[PDB]
């Protein structure tokens, strides 16, 4: 894939939502099958014993 | 009696940006006035409904 990217066949891209969809998101005005995109977090522990 | 109305957030921003109207008082102004209009019409309607 990287070799293609250098050749210019594929390039990175970043766009934004059209405002029409940005209103009709999961609900409003009877639209269906368009959930939001969410983020969360997870907390994990580590434990350390003691030698002598 | 009861009424309700809903507006998108983007529309509220869009309406204020290009017209100076907050898009929230207008719906409040429209709904509050409409209910009083119907009731005001109704009472007159009953008076003729009952007049000999």
UniProtKB/Swiss-Prot annotation, chain A:
PTM comment, free text: A proteolytic cleavage by the prohead core protein protease gives rise to the mature major capsid protein during virus maturation.
Function field: Major capsid protein that self-associates to form hexamers, building most of the capsid in association with pentons made of the capsid vertex protein and one dodecamer of the portal protein. The major capsid protein self-associates to form 160 hexamers, building most of the T=13 laevo capsid. Folding of major capsid protein requires the assistance of two chaperones, the host chaperone groL acting with the phage encoded gp23-specific chaperone, gp31. The capsid also contains two nonessential outer capsid proteins, Hoc and Soc, which decorate the capsid surface.
Quaternary context: Homohexamer. Interacts with the portal protein. Interacts with the capsid vertex protein that forms pentamers. Interacts with hoc; one hoc molecule associates with each capsid hexamer. Interacts with soc; this interaction reinforces the capsid structure. A total of 960 subunits of the major capsid protein forms the 160 hexamers.
Family per record: Belongs to the Tevenvirinae major capsid protein family.
Protein name: Major capsid protein
Gene: gp23
């Amino acid at each position: 894939i990287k070799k293609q990217m250098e050749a210019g066949a594929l390039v990175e891209i970043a766009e934004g939502m059209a405002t029409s969809i940005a209103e009709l998101q999961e609900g409003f005005n009877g639209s269906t099958d368009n959930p939001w995109n969410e983020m969360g977090f997870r907390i994990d522990k580590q434990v350390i014993e003691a030698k002598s | 009696r009861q009424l309700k109305a809903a507006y998108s957030i983007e529309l509220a921003q869009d309406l204020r940006a290009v017209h100076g109207m907050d898009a929230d008082a207008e719906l409040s102004g429209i709904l509050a006035t409409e209910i009083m209009l119907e009731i005001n019409r109704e009472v007159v309607d009953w008076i003729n409904y009952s007049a000999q």
